[PDB]
Amino acid sequence: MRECISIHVGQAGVQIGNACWELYCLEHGIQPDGQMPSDKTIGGGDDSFNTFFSETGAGKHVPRAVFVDLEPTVIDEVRTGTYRQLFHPEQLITGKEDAANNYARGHYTIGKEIIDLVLDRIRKLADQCTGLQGFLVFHSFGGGTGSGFTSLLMERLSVDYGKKSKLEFSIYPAPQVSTAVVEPYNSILTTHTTLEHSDCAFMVDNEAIYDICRRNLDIERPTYTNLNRLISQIVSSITASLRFDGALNVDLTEFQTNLVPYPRIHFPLATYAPVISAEKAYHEQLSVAEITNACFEPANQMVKCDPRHGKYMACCLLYRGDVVPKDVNAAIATIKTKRSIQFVDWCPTGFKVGINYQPPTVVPGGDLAKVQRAVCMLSNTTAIAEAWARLDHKFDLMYAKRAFVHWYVGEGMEEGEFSEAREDMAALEKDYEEVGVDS
Amino acid sequence: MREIVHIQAGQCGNQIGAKFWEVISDEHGIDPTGSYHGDSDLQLERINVYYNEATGNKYVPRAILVDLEPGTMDSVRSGPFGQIFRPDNFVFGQSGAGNNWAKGHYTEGAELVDSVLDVVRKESESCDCLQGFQLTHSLGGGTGSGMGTLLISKIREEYPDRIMNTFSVMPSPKVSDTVVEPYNATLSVHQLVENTDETYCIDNEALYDICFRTLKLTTPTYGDLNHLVSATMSGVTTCLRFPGQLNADLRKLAVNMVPFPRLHFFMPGFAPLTQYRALTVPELTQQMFDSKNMMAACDPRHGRYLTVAAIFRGRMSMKEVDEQMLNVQNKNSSYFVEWIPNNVKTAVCDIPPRGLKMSATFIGNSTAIQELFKRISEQFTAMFRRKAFLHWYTGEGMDEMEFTEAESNMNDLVSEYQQYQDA
Amino acid sequence: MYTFVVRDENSSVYAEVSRLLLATGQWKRLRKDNPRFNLMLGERNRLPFGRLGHEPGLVQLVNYYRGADKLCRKASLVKLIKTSPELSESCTWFPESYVIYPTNLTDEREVFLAAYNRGNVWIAKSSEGILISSEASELLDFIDEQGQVHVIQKYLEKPLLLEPGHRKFDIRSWVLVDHLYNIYLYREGVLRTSSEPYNSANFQDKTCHLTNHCIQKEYSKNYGRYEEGNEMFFEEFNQYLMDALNTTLENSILLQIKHIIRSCLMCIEPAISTKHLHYQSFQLFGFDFMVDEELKVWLIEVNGAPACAQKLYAELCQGIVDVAISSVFPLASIFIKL
Amino acid sequence: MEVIELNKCTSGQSFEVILKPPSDPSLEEIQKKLEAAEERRKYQEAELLKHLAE
Ligand SMILES: Nc1nc2c(ncn2[C@@H]2O[C@H](COP(=O)(O)OP(=O)(O)OP(=O)(O)O)[C@@H](O)[C@H]2O)c(=O)[nH]1
Ligand SMILES: Nc1ncnc2c1ncn2[C@@H]1O[C@H](COP(=O)(O)OP(=O)(O)CP(=O)(O)O)[C@@H](O)[C@H]1O
Ligand SMILES: Nc1nc2c(ncn2[C@@H]2O[C@H](COP(=O)(O)OP(=O)(O)O)[C@@H](O)[C@H]2O)c(=O)[nH]1
Ligand SMILES: [Ca+2]
Ligand SMILES: [Mg+2]
Ligand SMILES: [Mg+2]
Ligand SMILES: [Mg+2]
């Protein structure tokens, strides 16, 4: 058994983290007070769920997690929330005033003052681990803390834990739910600084989640609560292999091995199906073929883009529920003859498949109906570069006029960092183009 | 708890500031005694931003009242909510400033300023985490304009890393007290360009026009004008006073609204302009963008929006709000600068203002605001070219060169707006 | 009130479309960089498809299908037909073609020589720059002094010749594919004819062999003797077929043309369809056909950014507005649906 | 289309199907960057206080 430590940074990271651990407890039969009657070994153990949960002598199952935010209001909700007994005060870190949607404020000004505190709290979790394998880091691109402090934290983690893998779950900015005009600045700055310190990053575009909630859950105006419970289901599908008995993606290093052939190109596209409204009284359960077919539809992707006009480097299928290998292969065979699936020449055209018999767990009173089977596809496709192109274009529009730049320089950041960050993104787009397109 | 410290200076400053506290005390369920008698807990969740808690669960405005003469502040203390202010926070002299920026800034104000800063320091020390300051004042008089900007400079010296915000009332010949108002306003704008992060430009010309043309008030009084201002102030501070995601604090608002340091002068708007018929969301949205609902007497169509913040209050479809806000942008995209993507942000608060089912408040950083400054500059030059009325200022030790510098800087500001209007 | 942007100033077709939109009073033209558009008249090269469909509150439409270039590039068209099982290696309406890369640089240089040894007049062309030879020796020596890729297909030695004049021709058909992937064939096509007699013994001359309007008004006189600007329309051509061959244009030719159009576009549909996509697209295509002595129709190429005949500009562009644009953005048939 | 590495347990199964074969900054350096930014903030604030002193 090898432990994983989750780190939740800023409002988005914390609120998503709260939704994930809520779901984790429901999936593992852990009560809000920490007790888990299924676990017969009291005070310890090396089961698969122990990768995410430690144990006390009283029988409390405690999340291997740290929550960090530069203002206290969001984390204070965790301290008094339903699962307040789950976490102990040392795990929840709050500052006084936030980064004001300013990367430089989060990275340099406030980051410098709190980075040592956060690392020592992480050390305390790491000291409990017999064989720590790495970290899962949750944060937004657009927030000052999410962008700025995360990139600093990721740098220091590479220093203090050189052999440890680091995975990201990153919230990509969408103006429909965005809170800052400068989020493109923050996104490019944090991607530039974090790029060499992250082994595998799962980007989630708020635009995609927003539209899935409207389209499939019939929610007229999705809130963060609606968005986070859906994101939580996808995150759960991705991390399920670490928390349950299995033979695929059983360790963090395997994510890189299976999904990331080239280091810089470490942003897999996630696609999830099915998403069905709980308010829908009459519903017909979808088959293996149908939910697998839905994995190649842009409307179900965590980032809107067109994989038909890109190339695949790797593809992983993660099933939950009533699924057998026979039906998966029959589904894939049909899809290959009816859809455009181009792999790069230096990679085998194939799928790694994982099946967990336990169907998806849904929060009671949530928006998601319980289904007999679901699937999350993780595919490393060059089509996700469309998201970088969009972001870089918005960056270019503002930076050409140096709009808002003085806020960053005022926090001690050099104007050159804008250029260096943008040049790095230009190279990243070029890398995708070289791998993906022809002539 | 991120506290704001409120300061009101001079006649205009204290009269509009008093009305502001009356309005938001009512919104937060605070009676004119400090006692809370509301029904919703949304009223108290962010009450500490503007109020301190005293003995017996009393709420006291974090407000400092300043003037160089006792008259207006005597009237405030005799007012309806007059007893709610902290007695020690009344700081006043006896001499007056005679509508003279120099008296407020250099002589009479200089004698009083340290005692104001003592009170400012006392309030700041009580704060768990001070955001910054908001000042209400006029630019056309002596105390609010001269001593008000003196105060801003001194505060910035002691609290250089805090946000400075002002509600600044711009003078107009239509509603004028003295001929030297353009002098006092030009000297003040110079100060504001350098030492504030956010300034709401409240034009008395616009206020008068709204009362007369739209509200059909035959003979508008300052009281009628202040009704519009207190309503505007309530609306633009809604995001600060209630739970929300967008512009929830002074610094996040500034980062969203101010792309260039000197261009931080906002045109505020409000709808509906105040019978029993509630306004639909399309009506709120259309009216809040209408020039007739603007408080700066500038035509938005004569310029472009760099950034816009819109706040909707009341029970309404958040979906319909989004659609209408997108509708405005998509059908008038020429008036929004292209080089700042998604530059219009919208917030919705469930608590509506008193007497209204639904309300909308508009905050725009528009290049059309240059019309306001050009108006002042012309009135300034008309007198200054003949050195008219200058002896009032040179008598207080000021030199003509200081007037030339203020004029040049405001003309520079106008030029900078024009640059980004064409960009 | 709908809005649109223009990013291809050199398009005669969509310049006229731009006119009609403005003439309705319900369309406004924005700056080319303004992201808040409903309709994009895109550029021919490197159209930013990735930036489309991400503007909240806006239904966005573009006048190009992403991926359609596979039909509209000569090297790509050959590869598409031979690779796609829907079109198969044994395609009857497409001339035997081979993709040949220059040696100075998936190549079929060897395969071409095999069939050649087995009339052997072939034609060399790329995406003026055409060599028509009956000897494969000088065909291959032509592509190594250019640089880019080329294709070698059988030069149809027995074309249908119009009389009087004994002259070669080609048929241009305009095809509009809307956002629902309905295939619309414009009822009016054009005959780009040669004004010189066809000589099967003079391939040195590149005039009576190339029916290009570029090489009929230039480097070629007479011109406009038989028909105005070497362009014959379907009314006259159909009358000619009835008088000379006792058949109709619909029966002898158009039936095959419609079949070929359908086959090509249905083949790439799953690759380019915007049915469940966050932005919608349509596109106008120019299909070029060749007819032999036995009234068999051959596909020559497909043009992704075609111009139109001067006479037919008004009707077609209006048809584009009604079918492709107004269908998505309604205001306050000249096409044959395939 | 062949299936390889089929592993089975009580909680589920995993396998691989192939359709076609193929054809850091030092700790000291971090602190230097942070201290450099701090000194720039200090210089900017020093210039402000100088300006206000004038
Ligand atoms: N999906 C999702 N997105 C969120 C959530 N909270 C914030 N965001 C997004 O994250 C961006 C704002 O960043 P935040 O995470 O709120 O900022 P922060 O990291 O707390 O940093 P500062 O507040 O600036 O110190 C915007 O794009 C929001 O749409 C959430 O709970 N769920
Ligand atoms: N296999 C073949 N047999 C007979 N003639 C042929 C041929 N291939 C090409 N041609 C002739 O060559 C001419 C030009 O061919 P091609 O289509 O390659 O040029 P082009 O692409 O410039 C025409 P456009 O671009 O205007 O549609 C055609 O008019 C046709 O008559
Ligand atoms: N809107 C409004 N404007 C005022 C009020 N009182 C004064 N003014 C304006 O403020 C300017 C006079 O400044 P005032 O505040 O009286 O001088 P001070 O006491 O020296 O600051 C003139 O432009 C007046 O039109 C008021 O109550 N409301
Ligand atoms: Ca145990
Ligand atoms: Mg935050
Ligand atoms: Mg007065
Ligand atoms: Mg061509």
DSSP string across B159-195 = -TTSEEEEEEEE--GGG-S-TTHHHHHHHHHHHHHHH
Task: Please name the residue that has the structure tokens 């291809």.
Answer: C8
Residue of B nearest to D52 (CA): B157
Domain boundary among B231, B259, B287: B259
CB B232 within 8 A of CB B298: no
Q: Which residues in A lie closer than 8 A to residue C48 (C-beta atoms)? A: 389, 393
Phi, psi of A429 (to 5 degrees): -65, -35
List residues bridging with C186 in a β-sheet: C335
Q: Of all protein residues, whose CA lies closest to atom 13 belonging to ligand 2?
A: C210
Is B143 near ligand 3, meaning CB less than 6 Å away?
Answer: yes
Is B93 near ligand 3, meaning CB less than 6 Å away?
Answer: no
In a shared domain, residues A3 and A126: yes
Residue of B nearest to D50 (CA): B157
Q: Which residues in D lie closer than 8 A to residue A413 (C-beta atoms)? A: 37
Q: Which two tokens stand for residue A11?
A: 């409002």
**Omega within 30 of 0 (cis) for the link into C164:** yes
Quote the strand ranges of B10-103, DSSP E.
51-53, 59-61, 63-67, 90-92
List residues bridging with A379 in a β-sheet: A269, A315
B219, with CB counted inside 10 A (0-12, 13-18, 19+), is exposed
Closest partner CB to D15 (pick from A158, A159, A325): A325
In a shared domain, residues B53 and B140: yes
Quick check: B251 contacting D, CB < 8 Å?
Answer: no
Q: How far apart are CA B375 and CA B369, in angstroms?
A: 10
Contact C50 A175 (CB under 8 A): no
Q: How far apart are CA B94 and CA A113, in angstroms?
A: 47
∠ Cα A308 A313 A319 (to 5°): 85
Q: How far apart are CA C272 and CA C313, in angstroms?
A: 27
Phi, psi of B278 (to 5 degrees): -70, 150
If we measure between CA atoms, which residue out of C191, C188, C186, C190 comes closest to residue C320? Answer: C186
CA distances from B376 to A218, B400, C102 (A): 54, 18, 73
In a shared domain, residues A110 and A225: yes
CB C261 within 8 A of CB C255: no
Q: Which two tokens stand for residue C5?
A: 């942007």
CB B135 within 8 A of CB B218: no
Closest partner CB to C58 (pick from B330, B338, B341): B330
Query: Where do runs of H (alpha helix) occur along chain C?
Result: 12-23, 69-72, 74-83, 109-117, 136-143, 214-217, 234-245, 249, 255-272, 313-320
Own/partner pairs, C146-150, CB within 8 angstroms, 24+ separation: C146/C102, C147/C102, C147/C104, C148/C102, C149/C75, C149/C99, C149/C100, C149/C101, C149/C102, C150/C75, C150/C100, C150/C102, C150/C124, C150/C125, C150/C126
In a shared domain, residues A24 and A126: yes
In a shared domain, residues B251 and B281: no
In a shared domain, residues B253 and B283: no
If we measure between CA atoms, which residue out of C203, C178, C208, C189 comes closest to residue C63? Answer: C178
Q: Which two tokens stand for residue B371?
A: 């019309």
How many CB atoms are located within 10 Å of the residue D23 CB?
A: 10
Q: Which two tokens stand for residue B159?
A: 């609290």
In a shared domain, residues B203 and B58: yes
CA distances from A171 to A14, A232, A296, A382, A436 (A): 12, 12, 22, 19, 24
Residue A171, CB-side half-sphere exposure with 13 Å CA sphere = 37
Domain boundary among A199, A233, A268: A268
Q: How far apart are CA A159 and CA A138, in angstroms?
A: 19
Q: Which two tokens stand for residue B315?
A: 């029970």
Residue A360 per-residue DSSP state: P
User: Separation of A74 CA from ligand 1 center, angstroms?
Assistant: 11
Q: Of all protein residues, whose CA lies closest to atom 30 belonging to ligand 1?
A: A12
Residue A179, annotated ligand binder? yes
How many CB atoms are located within 10 Å of the residue A388 CB?
A: 21
Residue of A nearest to D7 (CA): A247
Residue of C nearest to B331 (CA): C1
CB B169 within 8 A of CB B201: no
CB A371 within 8 A of CB A276: yes
User: Separation of C300 CA from ligand 2 center, angstroms?
Assistant: 6
Quick check: C64 contacting A, CB < 8 Å?
Answer: no
A393, with CB counted inside 10 A (0-12, 13-18, 19+), is middle
User: Separation of C252 CA from ligand 2 center, angstroms?
Assistant: 21
Q: Which two tokens stand for residue A101?
A: 């949607």
List residues bridging with B265 in a β-sheet: B199
In a shared domain, residues A179 and A281: no
Beta strand pairing call for A4-9 and A165-172:
unpaired
Q: Which of D15, D26, D29, D48 to mutate to test the interface with A (most CBs of A within 10 A)?
A: D15
In a shared domain, residues A273 and A128: no
| C246 Ramachandran zone, left/alpha/beta (phi>0; psi -120 to 50) | left
Q: How far apart are CA A331 and CA C33, in angstroms?
A: 44
Q: Which of C36, C58, C329 to mutate to test the interface with B (most CBs of B within 10 A)?
A: C36
CATH code: domain of residue A257: 3.40.50.1440
CA distances from B133 to A27, A351, B354 (A): 49, 60, 26
Contact pairs from chain A to chain C, CB under 8 Å? 38
Query: Rg of chain B's alpha carbons, rounded to an integer?
Result: 20
How many CB atoms are located within 10 Å of the residue A326 CB?
A: 10
Task: Please name the residue that has the structure tokens 């700790």.
Answer: D27
If we measure between CA atoms, which residue out of C176, C177, C179 comes closest to residue C279? Answer: C179
B354, with CB counted inside 10 A (0-12, 13-18, 19+), is exposed
The total domain count for chain B is 3
How many CB atoms are located within 10 Å of the residue C128 CB?
A: 10
Q: How far apart are CA C172 and CA C154, in angstroms?
A: 20
If we measure between CA atoms, which residue out of C235, C211, C236 comes closest to residue C288? Answer: C211
End-to-end CA distance of chain B: 40
In a shared domain, residues B251 and B354: no
Cα dihedral value D38, D40, D46, D47, nearest 10? -160
How many CB atoms are located within 10 Å of the residue B266 CB?
A: 26
Domain that holds residue B422: 369-423
Is B181 near ligand 3, meaning CB less than 6 Å away?
Answer: yes
CATH code: domain of residue B67: 3.40.50.1440
In a shared domain, residues A182 and A48: yes
Domain boundary among A352, A383, A414: A383
User: Separation of A54 CA from ligand 4 center, angstroms?
Assistant: 8
Domain boundary among B368, B390, B409: B368
Angle between helix B148-158 and helix B181-195 axes, rounded to 10 deg: 10
In a shared domain, residues A349 and A396: no
Q: Which two tokens stand for residue B140?
A: 């056309």
Cβ-proximal residues to B329 (8 Å cutoff; 6+ apart), any chain: B336, B344, C36
CB B13 within 8 A of CB B148: yes
Q: What is the 3-state secondary structure (H, E, C) of A46-79?
A: CCHHHHCEEECCCCEEEECEEEEECCCHHHHHHH
Identify the three-state secondary structure at position C333.
coil
Q: How far apart are CA B315 and CA A177, in angstroms?
A: 20
Contact pairs from chain B to chain D, CB under 8 Å? 9
Domain that holds residue A205: 1-268
∠ Cα A196 A202 A204 (to 5°): 125
In a shared domain, residues A360 and A244: no
If we measure between CA atoms, which residue out of A195, A168, A173 comes closest to residue A184? Answer: A173
A208 alpha carbon, closest ligand:
1
Is C290 near ligand 2, meaning CB less than 6 Å away?
Answer: yes
Element (H, E) at A398: helix A385-399
In a shared domain, residues B10 and B125: yes
Catalytic residue among A254, A284, A415, A434: A254
Contact B338 C35 (CB under 8 A): yes
Domain boundary among B330, B352, B368: B368
In a shared domain, residues A239 and A282: no
The total domain count for chain A is 3
List residues bridging with A315 in a β-sheet: A379
CATH code: domain of residue B283: 3.30.1330.20
In a shared domain, residues A321 and A196: no
Residue B377, annotated ligand binder? no
Q: Which residues in B lie closer than 8 A to residue D45 (C-beta atoms)? A: 160-161
Contact C270 A338 (CB under 8 A): yes
How many CB atoms are located within 10 Å of the residue A324 CB?
A: 12
Elucidation technique: X-ray
If we measure between CA atoms, which residue out of B20, B133, B35, B119 comes closest to residue B79? Answer: B20
Q: What is the 3-state secondary structure (H, E, C) of A133-199?
A: CEEEEEEECCCHHHHHHHHHHHHHHHHHCCCCEEEEEEEECCCCCCCCCCHHHHHHHHHHHHCCCCC
In a shared domain, residues A315 and A166: no
b (16+ CB within 10 A) / e for B98-120: bbbbbbbbbbbbeebbeebbebb
Q: Which two tokens stand for residue B391?
A: 């002896």
Residue C2 per-residue DSSP state: E
User: Separation of C284 CA from ligand 7 center, angstroms?
Assistant: 14
| Neighbouring chains to D with at least 3 Cβ pairs closer than 8 Å | A, B
How many CB atoms are located within 10 Å of the residue B173 CB?
A: 12
CB B252 within 8 A of CB A143: no
In a shared domain, residues A422 and A324: no
* Amino acid of residue C163: E
Residue B366 per-residue DSSP state: E
Contact C36 B322 (CB under 8 A): no
Identify the three-state secondary structure at position C174.
strand
DSSP calls for B263-321 = --EEEEEEES----SPPPHHHHHHHHHSGGGBSS---GGGS-EEEEEEEEEES--HHHH
CA distances from B20 to B50, B84, B204 (A): 11, 13, 17
Task: Please name the residue that has the structure tokens 């004119």.
Answer: B32
In a shared domain, residues B224 and B234: yes
Sign of the Cα torsion C140, C142, C145, C151 reads negative
Is B16 near ligand 3, meaning CB less than 6 Å away?
Answer: yes
Q: How far apart are CA C121 and CA C157, in angstroms?
A: 7
Q: How far apart are CA C79 and CA C60, in angstroms?
A: 32
In a shared domain, residues B341 and B380: no
Q: Which of A404, A405, A408, A409 to mutate to test the interface with B (most CBs of B within 10 A)?
A: A404
Contact A220 B249 (CB under 8 A): no
Q: Of all protein residues, whose CA lies closest to atom 17 belonging to ligand 3?
A: B141
Task: Please name the residue that has the structure tokens 């759960």.
Answer: A236
In a shared domain, residues B320 and B245: no
In a shared domain, residues B328 and B375: no
The verdict on whether A420 is a catalytic residue reads no
How many CB atoms are located within 10 Å of the residue A120 CB?
A: 10
Cβ-proximal residues to B25 (8 Å cutoff; 6+ apart), any chain: B31, B32, B61, B81, B84
List residues bridging with B193 in a β-sheet: none
CATH code: domain of residue B400: 1.10.287.600
In a shared domain, residues B331 and B374: no
Task: Please name the residue that has the structure tokens 């020589």.
Answer: C113
CB A141 within 8 A of CB A206: no
User: Separation of A146 CA from ligand 5 center, angstroms?
Assistant: 8
Cβ-proximal residues to A76 (8 Å cutoff; 6+ apart), any chain: A94
In a shared domain, residues B41 and B174: yes
Domains of chain C with bracketed CATH: 1-63 (3.40.50.11480), 64-95+158-338 (3.30.470.20), 96-157 (3.30.1490.20)
